Design a protein around this ligand. Structure first.
Ligand SMILES: [Cl-]
Ligand SMILES: [Cl-]
Lengths: 259, 260, 259, 260
């Protein structure tokens, strides 16, 4: 039991049923926190995750919601307050992406990604902070960004823009609510072994290509990101606000410049 | 005039009838460019701007369009090509802002600012790049950002996000289209003396407050931003792509840290 | 006992007798590590710190050395290997500063600060990595930077340049030695309650002025920085290399822009 | 010529006889400036450069000096003032580099690179600013950095540190002296086709390798960097201070992330 101060804190996690969201759900369970798992699409996956959280030593519910719908985010935070009594840590983790040459990217496709990856995190952040301010709680927000808030990403201009935006959103909220003890940070994962990438990583030629862009030489394990989230949510990170903490095996250091 | 390579280049400027947009229109007029002035609703200002460009030594048309509307952005670029025969430089300058405590900011208000400031520039950049790619033109995109792609902005989380987003958008498109000789850059204006800012800057105490945030000690003249736009659009900047060039009198250098 | 993996690791800390170096010495003692405290000037202070480390549950020696002298840094690392068997975590924390209008700053004064703050950290980093590479150890380097690797600092151009340099040094070493599992990171403290600042902070007008530049509204406690060092040295930060982790209460977010 | 405000301005350039330094000397010559060419030991190249400036349309002197020596930097700025009457633009361009595994890099080798690349520029900037402050001149400093103030560089940890240091140096001086109208900026060149680089760039495979790191697909011409220097030195950049302007054909945008 690492961060004893996390025990019984209420942690909401959008997209908490798979990948990084699930890894963070589990980790906060290992810290004996009260995890609220948001999911959009697949209850069976969310139920399987709810179980892991409970087994890990935590308490958990699942809540269906589309992060692009204001009522759903408001509902999610309200449900967390109903079920567990309060809110302590808000983790905006939901995200989508798809490759399209930028000059061929449709407005609807651009909007889907912006709506999901950035605006969803804004709504999440807003609702949590609103609750924190009204109830004098020194709460915590973790926004799930990407190396691509810094690394440009051709074929993924919508994704890159969404994370560049998330960066300035996080930094603004951190500055604006710092005097109230509310901290807001980003995590920036590199290439992580999650469902989204499972396709690419099966192709041994593609897996090696991805690996050649990671200086540490391996694709990240999702628990390596959850460890960063645990730290940032904890009182160990008490003087840490408005940062992006990259967990990327060195990827933002320019892989093409390796000796 | 200064940049001879700008002579007869077709330059589209969203929000080109007021403030920075207008100053750029005139400057490109001084370079004998052919300017396409986009405006939202105030035709008189647009027409006013139209003649300034002509009087400075260039050609100019005006075209109504709301950058939150895809058809308007598409129509703007199509009109530019119809009227002047081609497109060389695309300037996404339209922007809106308003102060709201962030936890109180409505979804509609957030969207209006994102849609205008970020999505509008995506749409403009896309339509321009599409034309450049289709016609093998080594064209140029300039996106109007702000010191607030770097400086966070309490009460303006939508504005800050929109420009942070615009930075990665620009950087991505510059990387993606660099092999085609298409350059894409941001300009980052600090506090500028634009018509819109006349309200705040008339008041001596508000003017001093703003000036205290500026290490060079004066509010920028719109022509100083237009000078950056002209440089970036010209072949003088031929090896410059994917950058943000701040014209802010030092504002991004943290004004609270000036010595006593 | 938070980071169980730190127990019995060898941690060298330049300038470990006072301020942040001392706070980190103590913290790694609380993790039951083997702390090597470097000091330049004042044995009595270093002895007082050695005691705190031992009391906190760790083992400790003190080693005199000037970080601007190559032989002293080489000696320090060699002494750590003699006394404790190996090296695991190298923390380059020594630093000096003084205000001078830049156009009046002497070359000797510029050099003292560069030599101390940057070159000392290079020598530290070099000697540790050399040991890591030769002995196949997945070691760790923490370089003590500052908000001023990012915030410019008039009257302190030597200091600012030294930390801007430290940033690219850290990033280069992180990239270069990533394939060997050696991680290299910076910590960037803001205004911290340490000896260097004790003068300024006594003057209630100056203390409030400094506080008005911290969004979180308080001057940092040195243990808040030591918590960051503990994290980064630990296996929790396994996928984290080449970063600067700012612990600054929001200072890098532009204090003049607070609402 | 282009920047009429540069006519008769006194421009000092360290390492001004070869490569980027030379290209800047010539460009400022084209603007009818008065150039002061610093060189380390090769007088013939310096004299060669001297006549190019004159032939391009400017005045020029040459002055020997090692930037690791304080007296040489001091003498350089003093000579410029003696000969031409004043100083307007200071360009710290001298730089050295060599590849060494970092854990094997000697203290002497580290120091040579820090002393030349970083400390030399501090000394040049200091001497220029001192003169500007003493004589109420709204002067200009340009420090020659590199993409490697942002892009880390295995085997060149000394070079990377020196330019990372140079970035905060420039930013600090810009903040500190902005109230006096003195602007201080970095230029960040990518891979450039300078005499020194002729060795690597003759070999087809090494040329292709380097070109593969450049999104625009070509090695920069020294004149493209000189174009940036001219812009930054001129009053066109009047509101631009404390920035790094990368002229790198997109290199800082992460070339490994270009699409297939
Ligand atoms: Cl500030
Ligand atoms: Cl890269």
């Amino acid at each position: 039991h690492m961060y004893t101060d996390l025990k019984d804190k209420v942690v909401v996690i959008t997209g908490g049923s798979t990948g990084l969201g699930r890894a963070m759900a589990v980790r906060f369970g290992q810290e004996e926190a009260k995890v609220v798992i948001n999911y959009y699409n697949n209850e069976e996956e969310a139920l399987d995750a709810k179980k892991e959280v409970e087994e890990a030593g935590g308490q958990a519910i699942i809540v269906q919601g589309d992060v692009t719908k204001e009522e759903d985010v408001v509902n999610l935070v309200q449900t967390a307050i109903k079920e567990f009594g309060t809110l302590d840590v808000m983790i905006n983790n939901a995200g989508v992406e798809n490759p399209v040459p930028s000059h061929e990217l449709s407005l609807d496709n651009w909007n889907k990604v912006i709506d999901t990856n950035l605006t969803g995190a804004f709504l999440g952040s807003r609702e949590a902070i609103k609750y924190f301010v009204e109830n004098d709680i020194k709460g915590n927000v973790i926004n799930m960004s990407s190396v691509h808030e810094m690394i440009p990403w051709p074929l993924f201009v919508h994704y890159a823009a969404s994370k560049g935006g998330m960066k300035l959103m996080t930094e603004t909220l951190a500055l604006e609510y710092a005097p109230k003890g509310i901290r807001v940070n980003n995590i920036g994962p590199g290439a992580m072994n999650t469902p989204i990438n499972a396709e690419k990583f099966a192709d041994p030629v593609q897996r090696a290509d991805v690996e050649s862009m990671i200086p540490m030489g391996y694709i990240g394990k999702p628990e390596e990101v959850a460890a960063v989230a645990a730290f940032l949510a904890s009182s160990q990170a008490s003087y840490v606000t408005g940062i992006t903490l990259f967990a990327d095996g060195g990827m933002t250091k320019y892989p093409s410049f390796q000796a």
